Amino acid sequence: VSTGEFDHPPFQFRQRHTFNTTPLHDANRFGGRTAYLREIGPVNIKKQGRRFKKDPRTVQFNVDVWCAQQTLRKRWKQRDWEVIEIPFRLVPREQQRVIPELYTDIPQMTDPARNDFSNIRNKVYDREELQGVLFPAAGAMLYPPLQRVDKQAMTLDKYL
Amino acid sequence: GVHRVGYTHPSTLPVPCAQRWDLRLARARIFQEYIEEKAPGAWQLEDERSM
Amino acid sequence: RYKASPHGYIRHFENEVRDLLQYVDGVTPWKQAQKIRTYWEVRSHHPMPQFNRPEVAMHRNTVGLLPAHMWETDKKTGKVKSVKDSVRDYQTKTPYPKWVQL
Amino acid sequence: SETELVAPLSCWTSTSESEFSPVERVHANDTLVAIARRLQCSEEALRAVNDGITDVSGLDFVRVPPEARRPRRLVEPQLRPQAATDALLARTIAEEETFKLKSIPHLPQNAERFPHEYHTPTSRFPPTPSETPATQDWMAYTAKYLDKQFTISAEPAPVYNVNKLWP
Amino acid sequence: HRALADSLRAYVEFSTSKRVEPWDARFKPFDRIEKDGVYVLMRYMMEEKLQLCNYH
Amino acid sequence: QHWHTKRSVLSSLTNGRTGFIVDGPTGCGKSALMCQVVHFARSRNIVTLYVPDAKVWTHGEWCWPSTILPGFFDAPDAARSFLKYFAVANRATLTSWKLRCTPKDLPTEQGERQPQNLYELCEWGHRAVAPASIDRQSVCVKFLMDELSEEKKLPVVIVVDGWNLFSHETHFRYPHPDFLRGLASFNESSTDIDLYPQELPRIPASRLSFVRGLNKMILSGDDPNKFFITCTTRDFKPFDGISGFPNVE
Amino acid sequence: LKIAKSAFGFYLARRGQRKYPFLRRPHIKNTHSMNPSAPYFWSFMTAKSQMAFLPEENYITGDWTGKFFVSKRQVYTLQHATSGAKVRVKSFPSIFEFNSPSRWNIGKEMNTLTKPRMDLIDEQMLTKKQRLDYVRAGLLPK
Ligand SMILES: Nc1nc2c(ncn2[C@@H]2O[C@H](COP(=O)(O)OP(=O)(O)OP(=O)(O)O)[C@@H](O)[C@H]2O)c(=O)[nH]1
Ligand SMILES: [Mg+2]
């Protein structure tokens, strides 16, 4: 549901900088990438040009690679986590099952019987709850345990 | 980040377990699979348009 | 004559590949295959075989790359007027790469 | 004058001795009981070859009894023996000796100096930068470059494998 | 041949020689007075490198 | 306002934590609620830090290594503007404040005065010609926070809008180590800094000298003098699983 | 076609100035093949990798009587210069010879050493009308 532009504008009569119109390879499109596509100047057709830069299919392919990079980039900035490979024994009760690979079965609910329905795929675990498991060697806990909020405590929002 | 990919042999863990890369080599023997050594880790790009 | 024959993609042809290799190797004297050159071995005798294109390393070009002794310059402009002849005085211990004996 | 001959691959005979690994690796958690169960041995037989050892904690490798039911094979069986592939190449291997070919250089002498010039057609973008010693996390970096009396040399490293590119 | 020789000479002479500053000073963080901000960051940490690459 | 009397009441109202963090969706009352708290606090004449937008620190113009704290960092522009407005907002109370620990030797230009107040100190921080302002502000922020943590009787209200920016990494990354080692040619140093860009680990906000000061007050007990009424910001760009390029108009 | 410069003048239609899909024009006429670049010298209209072997056409493949011209994708090799043997290429009107050998040629394909469209024009291969049209464009003097 993005508002951004995913399509390169079609070649036509030369666009110029106007109210309501900008040049085709103007620096403001695709975050200035259009540099890669630009033949500057009053191009002399017969003698000069770089053919791929006016070609619709080629140009659009390039733009599509750039969009893909944008999405990839933002999906990785979106991660706060690493995948760690933990032996079956030591893992929390919810993962003790079989977990079909991606796009293999129906998107899968973590624990329907305990009232948790969410993708097991996207469930993220706290480095602090897995401490005993991930750093057994260390003796004394490296990360201090999470402090949690009493939801039965009388605090400012309960009006007391 | 620029890092060294790393592998922990199961004999060295404080519980033996089957490492995903090892499994990957199994899968490569079974369906004979070219493992591209120079495949850049940074270049995962799904094809947005069709996917 | 009645064989199971692989089809389509080249992977499926494992047997055939081995045979094609065996055959090729058997038929093809090293004496002859010596003589096939790679572009860089050939270009090694061009007077300026190595420099950086502008995309990545351009600023790493050195003035030491230029074969200035090969040409003739104008003092005022700083421009190349003529080029000396390359071939007559050209000495090399390596017309072919060092490992090629014909 | 030349000293020996090597038999063609079809003439080779395999022995249990050459085929199965004599020795076994020891896991961190290992007991003699565990190892024996893994190799199907009786525990006493495992002791016998290993000199009545009791605790295995100080050992990389334990010697395996011939009595063992499940051994490891020394090398993957479905692998092709090198004698076969070299039988494919026989003429070439004789020519290698005739012409006294030690090496055929793939790249020109100075090639690493020009990064964008020699791109083999197996090479892929984006290029990877050479590694750097302390870079993997802020604590390591800080310890090595910024503040050098910093006590924690790296941020706690989970003993299990962390897959940084994933999937 | 001489057109080529000469243009190689020119190309390398350009790669080797210095250039004008690449950044547009009309915007930020570059407009800032040369004694502060990015320019401080440049004078003390990046200067040597910026000169090695000749402001290409 | 008078906490020392009400200590039990207060501590039960936050349940032992040091103040609150207000959270919600984008665009509900959060930043506004913080404004109001600053109004209530300052009208009642309490000493108040107000960071109106946290992004001026963690996502900044630029980032200097701090001068006297090894291994930490500054946002020099954020810091300077802060030292300025903090001083002029609290000037009444801050002029009564005497310095329990700051060196009495501070470097000073001819015709200028050694600070005897917290106000005087903050003044000393931001009034200088650049570049001097830059190192002065580092020293000054370190000592300011060291002074704040040492005051146990005078209520102090710290309002930070967008705390959630202070609790993770800033958008600055540690300089590539080859900026630190000096160089002859790019030709062969075995260096890539000019060839390829690369990401180095982000600098965590907790390594900003300012945020260090605050965290020091939160985490150490034996500071029940201080109240953090703090806020969250969800102002982030939208991302739904594909992104095109934003139309700049 | 209007004028028949070859047999195909009879068989082919021009279809005005008609557009073909990208990089497929029926007839490969490489006007650009000699198009000077100092910085791109080794990447332009040459092999995409310097580890590629020279083409078929640098080698004598079979039992030959001899050839008239060598192909134009043949690459100029130090021996082309040194050996002092005939090196011909088929260009128009007839054939171009490399007579004056230089090392500056080495490592490029003869495509690149032979100017396809010469600044030189024969007035005798031109109709009086065509000569007029070449004077309009400011090529021929008159
Ligand atoms: N007068 C008044 N105006 C409010 C109040 N809450 C919201 N507004 C108005 O509505 C806007 C809501 O914007 P913010 O309060 O900045 O939204 P926010 O919760 O800080 O959301 P993010 O910063 O985007 O995480 C404000 O700019 C105010 O103009 C309120 O409690 N009193
Ligand atoms: Mg807000």
Side-chain angles (χ1 to χ4, degrees):
Chain A
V1 198
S2 90
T3 337
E5 306 139 7
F6 300 82
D7 288 312
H8 176 78
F11 295 87
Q12 277 175 357
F13 55 86
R14 179 192 165 212
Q15 308 295 302
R16 18 208 96 178
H17 179 17
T18 337
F19 80 106
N20 118 102
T21 300
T22 49
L24 208 70
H25 288 351
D26 185 316
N28 282 229
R29 301 172 186 268
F30 311 125
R33 262 139 249 259
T34 51
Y36 291 89
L37 296 200
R38 186 156 53 227
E39 266 268 347
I40 292 211
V43 183
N44 180 349
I45 343 181
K46 294 183 176 178
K47 296 165 166 186
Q48 147 196 209
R50 284 207 57 189
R51 304 295 182 256
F52 88 87
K53 290 180 179 167
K54 357 134 62 182
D55 175 26
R57 201 165 153 256
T58 287
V59 160
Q60 181 65 229
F61 177 74
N62 280 298
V63 160
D64 276 340
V65 172
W66 295 330
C67 293
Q69 285 163 14
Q70 280 317 290
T71 290
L72 170 75
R73 170 200 147 219
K74 292 177 184 202
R75 272 173 195 174
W76 275 73
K77 222 209 259 196
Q78 179 164 76
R79 294 190 186 178
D80 44 6
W81 44 264
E82 315 166 316
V83 159
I84 305 181
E85 306 182 19
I86 303 162
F88 197 79
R89 257 196 232 157
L90 314 184
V91 138
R93 215 187 278 159
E94 329 161 3
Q95 250 96 18
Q96 304 275 35
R97 48 185 284 179
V98 185
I99 292 170
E101 280 191 326
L102 185 62
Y103 308 140
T104 272
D105 279 42
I106 304 174
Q108 239 139 152
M109 287 163 180
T110 302
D111 237 333
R114 318 285 199 154
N115 289 329
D116 166 36
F117 327 79
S118 39
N119 230 344
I120 344 167
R121 291 277 156 63
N122 305 125
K123 163 127 194 188
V124 161
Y125 289 92
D126 280 317
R127 189 171 293 262
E128 337 208 348
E129 297 192 13
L130 294 190
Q131 256 184 81
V133 163
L134 295 178
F135 327 94
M141 312 318 294
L142 299 171
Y143 300 113
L146 283 177
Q147 310 173 17
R148 287 260 180 175
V149 193
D150 288 345
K151 300 189 175 185
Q152 307 167 22
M154 283 293 104
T155 20
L156 222 220
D157 28 68
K158 315 256 172 184
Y159 251 101
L160 175 178
Chain B
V2 173
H3 64 291
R4 220 159 244 281
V5 175
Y7 165 87
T8 355
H9 188 82
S11 81
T12 318
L13 300 170
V15 152
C17 98
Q19 295 302 281
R20 250 42 152 50
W21 172 252
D22 231 302
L23 271 169
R24 150 74 183 156
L25 290 172
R27 184 201 330 150
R29 164 186 85 247
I30 297 178
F31 329 94
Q32 302 243 277
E33 266 174 14
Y34 162 55
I35 298 195
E36 207 188 358
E37 181 202 354
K38 289 177 193 163
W43 197 256
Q44 10 206 324
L45 312 188
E46 67 157 34
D47 175 22
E48 242 190 23
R49 280 303 185 136
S50 69
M51 276 281 300
Chain C
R1 150 79 244 252
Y2 301 113
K3 86 161 149 203
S5 41
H7 182 263
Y9 322 106
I10 281 183
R11 337 178 283 137
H12 295 150
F13 281 86
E14 55 201 290
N15 270 337
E16 289 61 42
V17 167
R18 277 182 294 257
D19 314 333
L20 171 75
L21 283 190
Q22 181 166 36
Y23 188 70
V24 152
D25 128 87
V27 191
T28 310
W30 175 251
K31 180 146 233 54
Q32 295 297 268
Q34 270 180 324
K35 307 170 188 176
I36 295 198
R37 286 282 85 67
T38 25
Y39 275 94
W40 66 266
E41 318 179 316
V42 167
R43 284 167 186 180
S44 75
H45 295 104
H46 184 273
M48 201 181 166
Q50 286 182 338
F51 57 79
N52 306 280
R53 277 138 79 195
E55 286 70 31
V56 179
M58 149 158 77
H59 59 276
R60 292 195 173 183
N61 282 326
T62 322
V63 211
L65 270 41
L66 299 175
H69 65 292
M70 218 69 73
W71 61 55
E72 267 324 303
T73 322
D74 250 328
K75 302 190 168 190
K76 295 189 176 180
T77 331
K79 253 179 136 196
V80 180
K81 59 175 168 189
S82 60
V83 181
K84 301 170 158 193
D85 75 303
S86 356
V87 183
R88 277 189 191 181
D89 323 334
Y90 186 61
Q91 301 302 332
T92 194
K93 245 218 145 195
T94 353
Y96 310 114
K98 174 195 175 189
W99 50 268
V100 174
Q101 48 254 22
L102 334 82
Chain D
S1 103
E2 73 183 286
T3 303
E4 287 165 14
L5 276 202
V6 178
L9 172 67
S10 42
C11 302
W12 299 6
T13 334
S14 50
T15 318
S16 67
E17 289 203 8
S18 64
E19 178 113 3
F20 293 106
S21 151
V23 84
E24 152 79 2
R25 280 195 75 164
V26 216
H27 307 245
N29 299 326
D30 262 342
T31 313
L32 275 170
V33 199
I35 303 201
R37 179 165 354 109
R38 182 179 328 153
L39 307 183
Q40 300 292 72
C41 330
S42 63
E43 185 162 338
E44 294 191 5
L46 181 55
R47 278 189 150 94
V49 197
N50 288 308
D51 323 283
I53 47 94
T54 43
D55 212 85
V56 259
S57 66
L59 277 164
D60 278 313
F61 295 94
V62 224
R63 209 165 172 168
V64 191
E67 195 179 340
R69 306 169 183 203
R70 297 184 206 149
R72 299 204 136 78
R73 316 209 151 204
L74 214 59
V75 143
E76 167 60 36
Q78 197 191 323
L79 239 27
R80 218 156 164 274
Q82 197 154 29
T85 309
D86 298 328
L88 287 182
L89 298 190
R91 182 182 190 177
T92 264
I93 307 171
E95 315 239 53
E96 191 174 3
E97 180 177 42
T98 292
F99 288 80
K100 319 218 172 182
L101 279 204
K102 283 184 182 173
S103 63
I104 303 165
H106 61 324
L107 281 173
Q109 180 207 341
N110 266 313
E112 12 148 301
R113 275 197 176 172
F114 313 90
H116 206 62
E117 293 324 303
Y118 302 97
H119 274 149
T120 194
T122 9
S123 69
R124 302 207 54 203
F125 53 80
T128 330
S130 50
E131 198 197 20
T132 273
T135 269
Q136 265 174 5
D137 59 67
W138 74 270
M139 320 205 35
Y141 179 101
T142 282
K144 175 136 188 178
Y145 300 115
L146 303 186
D147 172 40
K148 308 203 170 185
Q149 297 82 53
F150 203 77
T151 42
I152 327 182
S153 56
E155 89 173 352
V159 63
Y160 303 103
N161 178 269
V162 170
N163 184 194
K164 291 255 191 65
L165 316 332
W166 179 96
Chain E
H1 293 336
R2 81 146 265 293
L4 175 67
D6 181 39
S7 34
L8 283 166
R9 169 209 56 97
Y11 177 54
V12 152
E13 264 184 40
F14 161 98
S15 331
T16 302
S17 74
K18 197 183 195 161
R19 316 259 124 251
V20 301
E21 313 133 30
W23 53 82
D24 194 16
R26 292 175 307 178
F27 294 75
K28 36 190 168 185
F30 270 107
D31 59 10
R32 202 180 231 326
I33 16 125
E34 59 162 72
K35 280 176 176 174
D36 194 38
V38 167
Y39 295 97
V40 165
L41 224 218
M42 283 166 48
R43 185 161 312 139
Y44 300 95
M45 301 212 49
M46 309 181 57
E47 185 159 277
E48 285 195 4
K49 333 286 162 192
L50 279 187
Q51 276 180 40
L52 277 203
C53 70
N54 285 305
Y55 290 82
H56 281 273
Chain F
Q1 197 167 13
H2 15 265
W3 62 282
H4 190 241
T5 313
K6 307 274 186 167
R7 208 173 171 199
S8 68
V9 175
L10 288 175
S11 64
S12 91
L13 262 170
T14 80
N15 198 352
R17 310 301 198 83
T18 345
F20 324 90
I21 184 166
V22 173
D23 180 89
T26 289
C28 17
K30 282 173 309 202
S31 286
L33 195 54
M34 290 313 94
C35 278
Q36 282 174 315
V37 165
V38 184
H39 186 209
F40 304 152
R42 277 183 186 165
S43 79
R44 288 184 174 89
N45 248 155
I46 301 172
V47 169
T48 331
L49 316 180
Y50 178 38
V51 184
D53 272 273
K55 61 157 183 169
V56 175
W57 301 81
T58 66
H59 308 239
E61 277 265 328
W62 67 300
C63 199
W64 207 220
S66 69
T67 300
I68 66 167
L69 249 38
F72 286 81
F73 289 93
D74 288 357
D77 299 356
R80 287 191 236 114
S81 88
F82 168 78
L83 286 173
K84 179 183 182 176
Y85 298 137
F86 177 61
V88 331
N90 300 265
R91 178 181 190 164
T93 325
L94 288 181
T95 313
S96 336
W97 201 301
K98 300 294 281 176
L99 326 100
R100 13 200 63 92
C101 96
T102 277
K104 318 189 176 182
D105 326 312
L106 287 187
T108 264
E109 302 183 336
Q110 277 178 20
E112 191 196 353
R113 190 48 206 179
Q114 268 295 332
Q116 278 89 29
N117 316 316
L118 202 49
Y119 169 87
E120 272 295 320
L121 177 73
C122 294
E123 278 316 308
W124 175 88
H126 80 264
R127 283 183 181 169
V129 206
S133 316
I134 293 175
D135 65 69
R136 258 172 183 234
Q137 127 269 122
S138 174
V139 173
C140 170
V141 156
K142 188 247 182 182
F143 284 140
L144 174 80
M145 230 80 59
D146 264 345
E147 209 81 82
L148 285 193
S149 87
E150 236 178 319
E151 172 62 37
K152 307 304 181 166
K153 301 169 191 168
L154 270 187
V156 162
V157 178
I158 305 165
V159 179
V160 164
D161 193 10
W163 185 261
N164 67 112
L165 262 31
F166 282 173
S167 57
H168 295 298
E169 317 108 344
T170 76
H171 72 3
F172 308 109
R173 309 183 115 86
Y174 284 95
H176 184 113
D178 290 349
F179 277 100
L180 305 162
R181 92 177 183 211
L183 241 53
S185 345
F186 275 142
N187 254 328
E188 203 147 2
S189 179
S190 190
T191 248
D192 290 351
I193 3 166
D194 37 282
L195 299 185
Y196 321 106
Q198 52 176 290
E199 299 160 339
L200 278 246
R202 289 216 222 175
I203 303 163
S206 318
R207 304 295 288 182
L208 292 182
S209 74
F210 181 82
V211 175
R212 175 205 134 97
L214 298 179
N215 270 333
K216 186 159 166 188
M217 291 158 45
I218 293 156
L219 253 41
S220 91
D222 293 345
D223 209 354
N225 177 36
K226 272 83 153 181
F227 302 88
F228 290 75
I229 303 173
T230 216
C231 186
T232 275
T233 172
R234 303 282 190 180
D235 200 41
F236 318 142
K237 308 195 168 180
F239 174 62
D240 269 282
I242 62 178
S243 70
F245 298 87
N247 173 23
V248 28
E249 266 173 355
Chain G
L1 306 173
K2 223 130 299 152
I3 286 207
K5 303 174 149 214
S6 92
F8 283 86
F10 300 87
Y11 314 131
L12 305 167
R14 197 175 134 243
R15 312 248 141 87
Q17 339 197 5
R18 102 200 213 45
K19 311 264 173 289
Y20 296 95
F22 180 58
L23 298 184
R24 317 206 176 159
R25 296 193 103 260
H27 180 77
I28 300 158
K29 151 199 210 233
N30 288 337
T31 308
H32 54 286
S33 41
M34 160 129 79
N35 240 26
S37 312
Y40 294 116
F41 189 67
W42 295 119
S43 80
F44 177 80
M45 290 248 17
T46 4
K48 295 300 187 179
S49 167
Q50 311 205 51
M51 300 188 61
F53 303 105
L54 294 207
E56 275 239 335
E57 313 158 14
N58 289 257
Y59 302 90
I60 292 172
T61 287
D63 275 0
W64 288 358
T65 329
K67 286 212 163 191
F68 283 102
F69 41 82
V70 77
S71 167
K72 243 183 304 196
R73 297 181 62 235
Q74 208 208 33
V75 356
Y76 196 106
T77 255
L78 170 62
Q79 283 59 17
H80 289 237
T82 291
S83 88
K86 293 300 304 165
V87 176
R88 269 194 220 97
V89 127
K90 188 198 170 213
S91 248
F92 183 92
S94 172
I95 43 98
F96 176 47
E97 313 180 306
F98 298 80
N99 274 344
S100 37
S102 173
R103 279 204 278 122
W104 291 90
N105 291 317
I106 295 187
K108 292 299 275 317
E109 330 176 354
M110 340 238 55
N111 256 356
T112 315
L113 313 174
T114 324
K115 186 69 169 182
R117 170 181 315 196
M118 301 164 47
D119 282 32
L120 193 81
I121 310 177
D122 21 12
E123 310 160 8
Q124 304 184 23
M125 205 182 82
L126 293 187
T127 320
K128 270 206 157 189
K129 178 195 163 181
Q130 291 175 337
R131 168 173 181 93
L132 290 174
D133 294 341
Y134 274 76
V135 176
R136 276 181 214 158
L139 301 172
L140 281 61
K142 244 188 172 182

